[PDB]
Nucleic acid binder design. Structure first.
Ligand code: GNP
Ligand code: GNP
Lengths: 178, 47, 411
RNA sequence: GGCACAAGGGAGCUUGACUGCGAGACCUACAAGUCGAGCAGGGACGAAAGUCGGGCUUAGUGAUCCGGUGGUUCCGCAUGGA
RNA sequence: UGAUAUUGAAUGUUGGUACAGCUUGUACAGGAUAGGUAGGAGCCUUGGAAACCGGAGCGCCAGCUUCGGUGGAGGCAUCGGU
RNA sequence: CUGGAAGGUUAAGAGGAGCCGAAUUGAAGCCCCAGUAA
């Protein structure tokens, strides 16, 4: 019945366990025009990112920490197989070509789309930062200390609010479930 | 006879408008001429 | 022949596309509420191929959506429009749920992309798990070639109209005629929005009925271009030759509604509805019979018919009435016989400074029309013109149709 | 008003049957309105130079105040955006 | 010719809101045949957990959701993918 | 014009088998009841 505080819930989701502390947030479609879906680099913070870099952009992609780049087309290797691993990003030139292949990325949630900051010319800066109207966000672990998830939820809430959606009218906040 | 518009393939916009007979040519024809935007001639098809 | 249908959500350029395929009958505005409210048919042409087209809609929402499901099944291939600018919405999956259980072919389309730079952002549209999206634009004719082929891949008489004022029962009238649920009926005025075609055969004879959603007062039409729908009624009148008028068992606008039809040179028939509502006993019909005769005198040839949609009485007599008006509206006469009687009229009325009559002949047969060769075109009097009119309408039938009369000079 | 050097026929694909653009006839009231010089960009059997079409004018009513939809290195009333 | 302030007092008839608590989504899988967000970090236990027999809602008229004492520290097994 | 459903038809069809049309459904209208004559 009682709404706890932020300084209490970080110390208490220690006790709700090495598990991962995640946050749900009910948003306030009618408002799809100014919907609230997104990604931001995190403060208090293993992935396997595979890139689709084209041209010279592969040359800076092999030194940042990526596992496999490609031989400029391995979607034929993606056809009939392809246990995908963690994250797929791309570049704004071959995205259309990969896209015209079908929904091998539709119901699997890895389709490159430049609304998320994942399809850009800065592939070296993109590898290094990734490593019904609702958003899910993993802010961290159980084993993090009490001062880590406070900055993590603060950064994510300031990101949500920094993004005060248009048609701001009416309540924006409905629920925080830590 | 009916009226027909031609569409660019490379550039991708309507450029030429003309007329053809349905019966004599029941299929879609490949016309080849200039697309001004491309600064270069490209194939055209009708919609 | 193959039948194609388009479904979707409010604001997806559907009616717009349908119009761009062929014609502009479909009403087009910019707002959430104003959408096509029911099925409508047409014809198309794409190579040897010649399929049709079914247009659907996005208060009362259950009915139209149900009507859309009716279309859904009896269709051959499915066109599923969706917007491109704002990505994926809740309503998209909502409709996708029924599409998944709809064991029919699906071709997806993406609108609102009218420039090359906007052609992208299609990868995101891979959720449906359907085939390849093909962009299209409404303002411009972009990307339609790929779409049509996408459809062609799976691809293998008289007309009369009914008009009136809103909230009279005109929609109930039609559906009952066919005996089929075809158009939406509601107790609120102006439920229907735009004209709907319906083709059917009666007694080895095919017919085409049309609705016009009723019309309010001419000063009463101040809305978000709902005149844009009113004009569609006007075009419909031009399309067909016979008009039936429906009054509920009299207001001057009903006379004004009959105004456009009479001047149009189109046969017009008087019909009443809801006869069950009023008292129904001996000699009741006379009161209305002379009231309409007294009110309406600039028309006389219109026969009077009685029907009640709810109880479905006398509805059979309505159709035949229409056929009789037809040939009357398309009938020529022997010029010898016509001029044979013109003089008898002048013999009995030798008081036309004096007009002279020499000749009269039928020219326009589409609508009973003729021309008289007189000495002085100015010397006439409209009453005398009204005199020669009745005489001819009494020599022969010419009933249920108007007559236009012309008077050329001697020359 | 043509005598084939403008009614046959492989290829040359093919409505440049185009995007830029301009000296004279007109009617000469002009506006308007029309018809035909002259030229960069490859764009052709093309090789020597031939290309803005169905070889008499005869049309898609007036093509417009017909824009309400769209690209904007143009303005934006105190400074940013709208 | 319908709304709204004068316009106040109690009966029952109901509604609409919100707030809790309980319950609901059988589907082409998975001990059957369930809506948008993590592959565990098992429960011993209990109208049966094998079989075992009530109760609706029901049923997708299939066969389930738990209120759930016999066998019962036995049981399915977090666990996999018509 | 008035009821009371009986007598069937169901009506173009909606549907269609063989070969244009099976079966099978299908409002009215025909008193199929008189009173009524406006
Ligand atoms: N910018 C832009 N606007 C478009 C395009 N196509 C349609 N629209 C706009 O979208 C409006 C909605 O289209 P409309 O056909 O009226 O939709 P509707 O009649 O409600 N039927 P439905 O909602 O199912 O599509 C149009 O009035 C037009 O202004 C397009 O390609 N680009
Ligand atoms: N009692 C009675 N009611 C009728 C009759 N015909 C129609 N109605 C009712 O009168 C209302 C009018 O419905 P509707 O057919 O939409 O009339 P409309 O509005 O004039 N047609 P539209 O919707 O196209 O504008 C409905 O509630 C209908 O049930 C009739 O003969 N008798």
């Amino acid at each position: 019945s009682k709404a706890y505080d932020v300084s209490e819930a970080v110390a208490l989701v220690k006790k709700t366990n090495d598990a991962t502390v995640e946050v749900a947030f009910r948003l306030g479609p009618r408002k799809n025009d100014q919907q609230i879906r997104g990604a931001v680099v995190l403060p208090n913070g293993t992935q396997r990112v595979l890139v689709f870099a084209k041209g010279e952009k592969a040359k800076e992609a092999e030194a940042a920490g990526a596992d496999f780049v490609g031989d400029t087309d391995y979607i034929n290797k993606i056809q009939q197989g392809w246990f995908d691993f963690d994250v797929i990003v791309a570049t704004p030139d071959m995205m259309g070509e990969v896209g015209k292949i079908g929904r091998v990325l539709g119901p699997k949630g890895l389709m490159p789309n430049p609304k998320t900051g994942t399809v850009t010319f800065e592939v070296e800066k993109a590898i290094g930062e990734i490593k019904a109207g609702n958003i899910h966000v993993p802010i961290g672990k159980v084993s993090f200390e009490d001062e880590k998830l406070v900055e993590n939820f603060t950064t994510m809430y300031d990101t949500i609010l920094k993004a005060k959606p248009a048609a701001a009218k009416g309540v924006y906040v409905k629920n925080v479930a830590v | 006879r009916v009226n027909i518009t031609l569409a660019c393939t490379e550039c991708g916009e309507r450029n030429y408008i003309s007329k053809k007979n349905k019966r004599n040519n029941p299929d879609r024809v490949e016309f080849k001429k200039y697309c001004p935007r491309d600064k270069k001639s490209t194939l055209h098809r009708e919609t | 022949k193959p039948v194609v249908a388009i479904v979707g959500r409010p604001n997806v350029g559907k009616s717009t596309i349908f119009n761009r395929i062929a014609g502009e009958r479909i009403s087009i505005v910019e707002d959430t509420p104003g959408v096509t409210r029911d099925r409508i048919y047409s014809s198309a042409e794409w190579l040897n191929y010649d399929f049709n087209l079914i247009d659907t809609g996005g208060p009362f929402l259950t009915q139209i959506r149900q009507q859309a499901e009716i279309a859904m099944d009896e269709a051959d291939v499915i066109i599923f429009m969706v917007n491109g600018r704002e990505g994926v919405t809740s309503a998209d999956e909502e409709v996708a749920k029924i599409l998944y259980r709809t064991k029919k072919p699906v071709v997806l389309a993406v609108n609102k992309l009218d420039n090359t730079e906007m052609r992208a952002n299609i990868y995101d549209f891979y959720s449906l798990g359907f085939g390849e999206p093909y962009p299209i634009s409404g303002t411009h004719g972009l990307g339609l070639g790929d779409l049509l082929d996408a459809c062609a891949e799976h691809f293998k008489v008289i007309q009369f109209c009914l008009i009136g004022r809103p909230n009279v029962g005109k929609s109930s009238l039609v559906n009952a005629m066919l005996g089929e649920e075809r158009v939406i009926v509601s107790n609120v005025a102006g439920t229907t929005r735009d004209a709907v075609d319906t083709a059917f055969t009666y007694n080895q004879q095919e017919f085409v009925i049309v609705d016009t959603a009723g019309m309010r007062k001419k000063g009463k039409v101040y809305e978000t271009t709902e005149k844009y729908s009113v004009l569609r009624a006007l075009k419909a009148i031009d399309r067909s030759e016979v008009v039936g008028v429906v009054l509920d068992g009299i207001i001057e606008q009903d006379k004004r509604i009959a105004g456009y039809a009479h001047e149009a040179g189109k046969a017009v028939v008087i019909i009443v509805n809801k006869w069950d509502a009023v008292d129904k006993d001996e000699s009741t019909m006379k009161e209305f019979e002379q009231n309409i005769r007294e009110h309406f005198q600039f028309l006389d040839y219109a026969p009077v018919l009685f029907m009640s949609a709810l109880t479905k009485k006398r509805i059979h007599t309505l159709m035949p009435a229409i056929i009789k008006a037809s040939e009357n509206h398309s009938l020529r006469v022997q010029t010898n016989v016509l001029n044979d009687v013109i003089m008898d009229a002048v013999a009995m009325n030798p008081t036309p400074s004096r007009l002279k009559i020499y000749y009269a002949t039928q020219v326009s047969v589409k609508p009973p029309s003729f021309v008289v060769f007189v000495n002085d075109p100015e010397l006439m009097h409209f009453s005398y013109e009204r005199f020669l009119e009745n005489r001819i309408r009494d020599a022969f039938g010419f009933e249920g149709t108007p007559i236009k009369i012309f008077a050329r000079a001697r020359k």
